[PDB]
Design an enzyme around this catalytic site. Sequence first.
Site, PDB file in Angstrom:
ATOM      1  N   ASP A   1      29.211  49.024  32.261  1.00 18.17           N
ATOM      2  CA  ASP A   1      30.195  48.782  33.306  1.00 18.17           C
ATOM      3  C   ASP A   1      31.000  50.075  33.495  1.00 18.17           C
ATOM      4  OD1 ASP A   1      31.967  46.331  34.695  1.00 18.17           O
ATOM      5  OD2 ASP A   1      33.186  48.007  33.987  1.00 18.17           O
ATOM      6  N   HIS A   2      31.340  50.697  32.371  1.00 15.64           N
ATOM      7  CA  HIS A   2      32.108  51.933  32.361  1.00 15.64           C
ATOM      8  C   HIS A   2      31.345  53.181  32.823  1.00 15.64           C
ATOM      9  CE1 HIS A   2      35.373  50.069  29.518  1.00 15.64           C
ATOM     10  NE2 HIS A   2      35.085  49.307  30.552  1.00 15.64           N
TER      11      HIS A   2
HETATM   12  C1  HEM Z   1      36.239  44.557  24.470  1.00 17.65           C
HETATM   13  C2  HEM Z   1      35.852  43.754  25.621  1.00 17.65           C
HETATM   14  C3  HEM Z   1      36.434  43.862  26.897  1.00 17.65           C
HETATM   15  C4  HEM Z   1      37.737  43.960  27.305  1.00 17.65           C
HETATM   16  C5  HEM Z   1      39.029  44.085  26.507  1.00 17.65           C
HETATM   17  C6  HEM Z   1      37.769  43.954  28.758  1.00 17.65           C
HETATM   18  C7  HEM Z   1      38.944  43.965  29.515  1.00 17.65           C
HETATM   19  C8  HEM Z   1      39.035  44.075  30.898  1.00 17.65           C
HETATM   20  C9  HEM Z   1      40.263  44.242  31.665  1.00 17.65           C
HETATM   21  C10 HEM Z   1      41.681  44.360  31.164  1.00 17.65           C
HETATM   22  C11 HEM Z   1      39.886  44.389  32.938  1.00 17.65           C
HETATM   23  C12 HEM Z   1      40.829  44.575  34.107  1.00 17.65           C
HETATM   24  C13 HEM Z   1      41.389  43.221  34.489  1.00 17.65           C
HETATM   25  C14 HEM Z   1      42.167  43.258  35.785  1.00 17.65           C
HETATM   26  O1  HEM Z   1      41.561  43.062  36.853  1.00 17.65           O
HETATM   27  O2  HEM Z   1      43.389  43.482  35.738  1.00 17.65           O
HETATM   28  C15 HEM Z   1      38.430  44.341  32.962  1.00 17.65           C
HETATM   29  C16 HEM Z   1      37.634  44.682  34.058  1.00 17.65           C
HETATM   30  C17 HEM Z   1      36.242  44.822  34.062  1.00 17.65           C
HETATM   31  N1  HEM Z   1      35.432  44.437  33.011  1.00 17.65           N
HETATM   32 FE1  HEM Z   1      35.993  43.968  31.163  1.00 17.65          FE
HETATM   33  N2  HEM Z   1      36.506  43.911  29.272  1.00 17.65           N
HETATM   34  C18 HEM Z   1      35.684  43.802  28.163  1.00 17.65           C
HETATM   35  C19 HEM Z   1      34.339  43.552  28.250  1.00 17.65           C
HETATM   36  C20 HEM Z   1      33.595  43.557  29.402  1.00 17.65           C
HETATM   37  C21 HEM Z   1      32.183  43.263  29.412  1.00 17.65           C
HETATM   38  C22 HEM Z   1      31.431  42.864  28.148  1.00 17.65           C
HETATM   39  C23 HEM Z   1      31.770  43.445  30.723  1.00 17.65           C
HETATM   40  C24 HEM Z   1      30.527  43.292  31.347  1.00 17.65           C
HETATM   41  C25 HEM Z   1      29.221  43.032  30.816  1.00 17.65           C
HETATM   42  C26 HEM Z   1      32.962  43.840  31.469  1.00 17.65           C
HETATM   43  C27 HEM Z   1      33.004  44.160  32.810  1.00 17.65           C
HETATM   44  C28 HEM Z   1      34.146  44.521  33.520  1.00 17.65           C
HETATM   45  C29 HEM Z   1      34.148  45.084  34.877  1.00 17.65           C
HETATM   46  C30 HEM Z   1      32.889  45.496  35.642  1.00 17.65           C
HETATM   47  C31 HEM Z   1      35.464  45.300  35.208  1.00 17.65           C
HETATM   48  C32 HEM Z   1      36.051  46.100  36.391  1.00 17.65           C
HETATM   49  C33 HEM Z   1      36.115  47.608  36.105  1.00 17.65           C
HETATM   50  C34 HEM Z   1      36.723  48.414  37.244  1.00 17.65           C
HETATM   51  O3  HEM Z   1      37.895  48.817  37.129  1.00 17.65           O
HETATM   52  O4  HEM Z   1      36.026  48.671  38.247  1.00 17.65           O
HETATM   53  N3  HEM Z   1      34.091  43.843  30.658  1.00 17.65           N
HETATM   54  N4  HEM Z   1      37.909  44.132  31.714  1.00 17.65           N
HETATM   55  C1  LIG Z   2      35.751  46.224  31.160  1.00 17.18           C
HETATM   56  N1  LIG Z   2      36.416  46.804  30.581  1.00 17.18           N
END
Ligand code: HEM
Ligand SMILES: [C-]#N
Lengths: 104, 104, 466, 466
Positions: free
Chosen positions: B94-95
Amino acid sequence: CPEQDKYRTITGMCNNRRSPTLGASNRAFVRWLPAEYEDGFSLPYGWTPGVKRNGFPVALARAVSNEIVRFPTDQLTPDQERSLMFMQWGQLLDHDLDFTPEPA
Amino acid sequence: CPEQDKYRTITGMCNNRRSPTLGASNRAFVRWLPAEYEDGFSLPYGWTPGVKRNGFPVALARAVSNEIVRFPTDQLTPDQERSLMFMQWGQLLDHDLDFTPEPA
Amino acid sequence: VNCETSCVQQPPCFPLKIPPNDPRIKNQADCIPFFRSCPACPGSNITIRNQINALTSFVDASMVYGSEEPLARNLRNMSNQLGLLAVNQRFQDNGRALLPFDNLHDDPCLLTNRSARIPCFLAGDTRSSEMPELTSMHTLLLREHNRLATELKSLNPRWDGERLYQEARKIVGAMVQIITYRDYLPLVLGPTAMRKYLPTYRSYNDSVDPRIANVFTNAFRYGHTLIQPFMFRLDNRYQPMEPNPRVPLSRVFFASWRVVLEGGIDPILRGLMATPAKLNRQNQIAVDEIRERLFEQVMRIGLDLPALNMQRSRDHGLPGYNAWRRFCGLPQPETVGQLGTVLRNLKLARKLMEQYGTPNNIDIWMGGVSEPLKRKGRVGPLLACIIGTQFRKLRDGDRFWWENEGVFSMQQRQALAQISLPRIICDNTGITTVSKNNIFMSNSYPRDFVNCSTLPALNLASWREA
Amino acid sequence: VNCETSCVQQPPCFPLKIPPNDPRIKNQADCIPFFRSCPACPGSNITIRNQINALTSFVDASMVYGSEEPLARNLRNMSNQLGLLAVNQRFQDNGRALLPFDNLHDDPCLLTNRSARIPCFLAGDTRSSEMPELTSMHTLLLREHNRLATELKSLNPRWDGERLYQEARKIVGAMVQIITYRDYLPLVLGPTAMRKYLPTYRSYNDSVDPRIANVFTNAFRYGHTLIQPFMFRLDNRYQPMEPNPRVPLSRVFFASWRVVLEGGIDPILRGLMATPAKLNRQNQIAVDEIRERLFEQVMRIGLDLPALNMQRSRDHGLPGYNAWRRFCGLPQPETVGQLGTVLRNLKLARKLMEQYGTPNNIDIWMGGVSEPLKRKGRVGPLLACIIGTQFRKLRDGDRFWWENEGVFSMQQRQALAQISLPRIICDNTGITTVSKNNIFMSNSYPRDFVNCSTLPALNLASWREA
Ligand code: HEM
Ligand SMILES: [C-]#N
Ligand SMILES: *[C@@H]1O[C@H](CO[C@@H]2O[C@@H](C)[C@@H](O)[C@@H](O)[C@@H]2O)[C@@H](O[C@@H]2O[C@H](CO)[C@@H](O[C@@H]3O[C@H](CO[C@H]4O[C@H](CO)[C@@H](O)[C@H](O)[C@@H]4O)[C@@H](O)[C@H](O[C@H]4O[C@H](CO)[C@@H](O)[C@H](O)[C@@H]4O)[C@@H]3O)[C@H](O)[C@H]2NC(C)=O)[C@H](O)[C@H]1NC(C)=O
Ligand SMILES: *[C@@H]1O[C@H](CO[C@@H]2O[C@@H](C)[C@@H](O)[C@@H](O)[C@@H]2O)[C@@H](O[C@@H]2O[C@H](CO)[C@@H](O[C@@H]3O[C@H](CO[C@H]4O[C@H](CO)[C@@H](O)[C@H](O)[C@@H]4O)[C@@H](O)[C@H](O[C@H]4O[C@H](CO)[C@@H](O)[C@H](O)[C@@H]4O)[C@@H]3O)[C@H](O)[C@H]2NC(C)=O)[C@H](O)[C@H]1NC(C)=O
Ligand code: HEM
Ligand SMILES: *[C@@H]1O[C@H](CO)[C@@H](O)[C@H](O)[C@H]1NC(C)=O
Ligand SMILES: *[C@@H]1O[C@H](CO)[C@@H](O)[C@H](O)[C@H]1NC(C)=O
Ligand SMILES: *[C@@H]1O[C@H](CO)[C@@H](O)[C@H](O)[C@H]1NC(C)=O
Ligand SMILES: *[C@@H]1O[C@H](CO)[C@@H](O)[C@H](O)[C@H]1NC(C)=O
Ligand SMILES: [C-]#N
Ligand SMILES: [C-]#N
Ligand SMILES: [C-]#N
Ligand SMILES: [Ca+2]
Ligand SMILES: [Ca+2]
C-alpha cells in the site's frame, strides 16, 4: 438540491442528484483520455522551440491548413442532400452545449 | 521526457511518454466515478447538520463502527490459511502505491 | 499583452506561428491571434490543466435562456406577469420582435459597419451575433417562447409570470431536443452509427455522466466543413433578394446591423432552407472565407478557422488521431499505407504524413474531418464515435429529457411529437412557404417546399390545467 | 482550529462526532481528530474537489527509494561508489543494518517511550515506523538492495555508484512486483477474480492509465480486517520470545524503540511467518486495538481506524456502495432483503439498513468488507473488482514492468522467477528456517517451515556485462 422540483435550474445544477454539478455551467470539462501537454501538465505542443511530439516536429497549425485544408473556391461542391440549415442548426446546437471561455 | 532512458525516474515522471505525469508523485488521483459531495463540489457528507444524503440522514462514522465493526476480541478467528505476513505485505505494498497528504 | 495585437508568446497567449512562404502572411515572424482557454485551476503545479464549459451541457435551449442566474433574469421581461423574454425596444422586424442589444466593452458588431451603429445582440449565449444566420435562429426561438407563453396564458389565466416562463421554456427545450435527435443527428451520423450510439431510449440513468467531454468541443467543429462562403438572402418567392442576395461571409461576421437594417430574419431563413450546405470532401475541406478571412472586419488580420481548431486542440492537451481511434475501438493506422487504406485516399494520407510525420500526431479535428463520410452521414467513423457517444450521454444522463417519466404527460408527449422546425418558422415569421421534412435534407425550391397552411399547429390542449 | 486538540468543525478539520452511549467516549463533546486530505486545487469554486497521491503509483519499491528527488538522494550513501542506501550510524541489529533515523519536528516515535529516545526511521515512505512489523519489512528490503549492490560490484568492476544503485533498485522493484502479483494478489482475489482482472500479461500498453484511483485508497484498506491485536515475537526456535512475546498493538504503533532495543527484526519476521492473520468474518470485522486504541500512545485520544476509513471516503467525495457495485457490473440491492441476499447475511444487512437507510449510502469500505469472501480469496466481489482493476492498470500501464520486453533479458527474467520473500529473509537476517512458499499461506511452524539451505539464491550471473 430540493427533494423535488418541476423545472430545470438555469445553471444545470441539481439535474443529477448524487453529483449536482454534472452538466452544470462553469465547471471543468470531463476528459475521455488523459491530457497531452509538452511538460505533461500545462504547456501545449508547439510552445517550446525544438520540443518534438512523440519523435516528430510539431506541425504548425497554419501549415496543415495551408497544405491540407486549402482548396479552390470555385471547386466547392453543393451538398445535394443537405440544406444550409443543417449547418446552422449544428452551430446553434453547439451553443446550447459548450462555450470555452478565454481571458479578454 | 528524454528520447531514451535506462531506468525509472524517482518521481515516476516520463514512464508514460504521451502523458508524462501519469503515475508520477504529487498529482491528483484519477476518479473512476464522479465525486459526491454535500454541496456537489467540496463539502463531505455529514458536514452540515440536517443535510441528508440521497434522502437519508448521514450515519456517524463512529456509530457505524460501534454497531457493525465492534466485536468481542475472544471471538477472533485466526486465519488457518494466511500468515500475518499476508497482512504486512499488504501494508508495505500500500505504501508503494499511495499516500494522501494532509495539512500539519 | 493583448493576444489580438501582438505576437509575443507569453500568458495567456499562444499565437499561431506562420510557415515560410505563407500565401497571405508574408512576414514569417508574425502570427495569427490566439488566447489560451481559461484553466479550471489557475496557476496550479499539481493539476493537469483542463478547460471550462461556461454553459449547461444539457440540450435545454440554454443559448436562449442563459446558463447563469443574473443573465437569465436580464433576458426576461419583468415589467409584467406574462412570462416573456425581453425584446428589442428600438427595432422591430416587420412588426416582429428582435433580440435586445447587449452592452459590451469592445463591441465587435459596431466595427462591422461604423456608420450603422448597431451593437451586438443579447442572448442566452454570448455568440448570437457571430453570423446573421445564427442570429436569425436565436430570434426565431425567442419569438416561439413568447408565442408559447401567450397561448399558455389564454389556456391558463391564473398562471403567473414565473409559471408561464417556466412552462414555455420547458416546451422550447423539448423542441430543441426533438429537432436535434429526431431530425438532425441521424443526418450527421448516418443510420448505422445512429443505431450503434443512440439505441432506443429506455429511461433516465442517474449513473450516466452528462458532462461535455473536452474532445467534443473540438470534434463537433466538423461543422466548419459545412460552411458556404456566402450568406444567402431570398425574397418571399425564394428569388434573390436584391441588391445583395449573396454576401461574402467575411462581411457578415458580427454584422448585427444587417438583421436590423437589411430586411430582418425572413430573407436569411429562406436562404438557409433553399440553399445547399457545402459538402465536405477530402480535397475540399473548408473555404477560404473562414480559412483566410475569418473575422476580417473585427481583427487586425483575417483569422484561419481550421488552423485555430488545431491550435485549440493542443491548447486543450488533446491526444492525437490514433489515441482517439483506439478509444473508439477503431484500427490505428501506423504507416502511410495503412492511413491510405483507412481514409480510402492514399494521396491525402501522404499529405498528412508529410505534415505530421506519424498518424499518432494528427490533430483530432484534422484527422476526424479527413475520414471518408459514413453512408447517409456527414462524418467518418471517428467523429461518429465521439459525437454519438456524447449525445447519448446528454440524452440518458438528463433528468429532464422530454421522454423521461414525469417530465411531460403522455398526451403532452404526443403533442410534442408533432413539432418541427418548418412549423416553428411558419408561426414566428412572415414566411408562408417552408421546407418539407426533413428540413436538413430539403434544400430546393419549389421542389422541397410546401405551404405553411398544410402544417398543423402544436396542440397545447394538454397543457390546460384542470 | 487545531484538528488534533480541538473538536470545532472548521477547515481543514472534519472531526468525527461521538454518538450517545458510546462504549468508550462517554463525553459527546469530545471527538476523534480528523484532518481533511489536501485538495488538488485549493479554494476553487470551479473544480470538483479531488485529493493528492504523494507517491509513484507504480509497483517500483518507492517506499524504499522515495518518490521525490531530494529524499531519494538523502536515502543514498553518497560517501562512496558502492551504490548503497544509507544505514543507521548509531545502531545495528546483531551486526546488521537498520534504517537511518529521520529528523521530525514532532516525532511521534519518541512519545511511545520517553526514556528510550528512539526517533522514527527515515525511509522512502513516511510511514515506515507506524508498526514494528512494517519497519522490519522496510529494513529487510534496504539490506537486500545493499546486498545486491555488493554482488553486482563483484560481477561488474567498472560499474560506478550510480549504475550499481540503479541496477540494485531495478532488481528490488522487480522483486516487489513478483512477490505481489505471483504470491500476494492471487490470495487476495481468489482464482476466479485473479483470472478475470489479471489475465496473462501480454506487453506494455501506453493507453492504460496507471494512476491510483481515488476509490482504491479506501478500498485497499480491506487489509485493516486482517490485523491481529498483538505483535508476536518468536526466538530462533520459533518459541515465544520472552519476556514480551505478545505486545498489544496499541503499544507498538510508532514504537521504533522496540526494533532498536528489543531484539531487532528477526523476532518480528519470525512472528509474521509463524502467526495466522486475522480472518475477516461479517461480525468480526476489525479489532479494538485499531478500533478503540489506534495511536493511543502518540496523541490525546485513541482513534478508530474503521470509523476513520468511512470519514475519509466522505472527505474524498466517494460514491456509495451501490454506485461502486454498478461500476463493477454487479447487482445493486435496494431492499434489506436484497442486501441480505448479496451479503448472504440478513442480520448484517439489517444493521447496515438501520445505519444507512439505503444500500446506496453504505460507505465504500464498510460495504466492501461486509461482502462474503470469494473462494480462496480474502475479499468479496466488489473489493475484488476495485483491487483487481487497479492492479491490472499498474501492470499493463507500466513501461518498466519486469516482464515488458527490453526491461530484462530472457535469462535475467528466468533468474528473477526464482526469487521469493522467504529467500530474501534468508539472505538478510539471522533467521535460518523460513516458511515454505507460498509465504502468505504458510503460517504453522514447523509444518510449514524449511531450512534456508534448500532455497536456491538469486543467480546474478546474467547481470555480467563482460
Ligand atoms: C500496522 C497496521 C496498520 C495500521 C496502523 C494502519 C493505519 C492506517 C491509518 C491511520 C490510515 C489513515 C486513516 C484515515 O483515513 O485517517 C490508514 C490508511 C490506509 N491503509 Fe492502513 N494501516 C495498517 C495496515 C494496513 C493494511 C494491512 C493495508 C492493506 C492491505 C492498509 C491499507 C491502507 C491504505 C491503502 C490506506 C490509505 C493510504 C493513503 O494515504 O493513500 N493498511 N491505515
Ligand atoms: C496503511 N497504513
Ligand atoms: C490498451 O489498453 C486500452 C485500455 O484498455 C482498458 O484497460 C485495460 C487495462 C484493459 O482492462 C482493457 O480491457 C480496458 O478496456 C485499450 O483501449 C480501450 O479499448 C476499448 C475497446 O476497443 C475501448 O472501448 C470502446 O470505447 C468506445 C468509446 O466509449 C468508451 O468511453 C466512454 C467515455 O468514457 C464510455 O462512456 C463508454 O462506455 C466506453 O467505455 C465505445 O464506443 C466502444 O463501445 C462500442 O463498441 C463496442 C464494439 O462494437 C460495442 O460492443 C459497444 O456496445 C459500443 O457500441 C468500446 O467500449 C476503450 O475506450 C479503450 N480505451 C482507451 C483509453 O483507448 C486498448 O485496446 C489496449 N490495446 C491493446 C493492444 O491491448
Ligand atoms: C446506467 O449507465 C451506466 C453507464 O453506462 C455507460 O454509459 C451509457 C450511456 C451507455 O453507453 C452504457 O453502455 C455505458 O456502459 C451503466 O454502468 C456501467 O455499466 C458497465 C457494465 O456493467 C460498467 O462496465 C464494467 O466496468 C467494470 C469496471 O471497470 C471499468 O472502469 C475502468 C476504470 O475506468 C475501466 O478501465 C474498465 O475498462 C471498465 O470501463 C469492469 O470490470 C467490467 O468489465 C468486466 O466484466 C465484464 C462482464 O463480465 C467483462 O466483459 C469484462 O471483460 C471485465 O471482466 C465492465 O466493463 C461500467 O463501469 C458502469 N459505469 C458506471 C459509471 O457505473 C449502467 O449499467 C446503466 N444502467 C442501466 C439500467 O442502463
Ligand atoms: C457562422 C458559422 C460559424 C463560425 C463563424 C464559427 C466560428 C468558430 C470560432 C471562431 C471558433 C473558435 C475557434 C478557436 O478555437 O479559436 C469555433 C468554435 C466552435 N465551433 Fe464553430 N463556427 C461556425 C459554425 C460552426 C458549426 C456549423 C458547428 C457545428 C456543427 C461549429 C462548432 C464549433 C464548436 C463546438 C466550437 C467550440 C465551442 C466552445 O467554445 O466550446 N461551428 N467556431
Ligand atoms: C414586456 O412586454 C410588454 C407587453 O408585451 C411590452 O410592451 C414591453 O415592451 C416588454 N418589455 C421588454 C423589455 O421586452
Ligand atoms: C452600413 O449601414 C448603412 C445603414 O446605416 C448602409 O446604408 C451602408 O450601406 C452600410 N455599409 C456598407 C459598407 O454596406
Ligand atoms: C556508506 O558505506 C560505507 C561502506 O559500507 C559505510 O562504512 C558507511 O557507514 C556508509 N555510510 C552511511 C551514511 O550509510
Ligand atoms: C522504554 O525503553 C526502555 C529503554 O530505555 C525500556 O527499558 C523500558 O522497558 C521501555 N518501557 C516500556 C514500558 O516498555
Ligand atoms: C461555434 N460557432
Ligand atoms: C435593446 N433593447
Ligand atoms: C541515523 N543513523
Ligand atoms: Ca445547454
Ligand atoms: Ca510506487
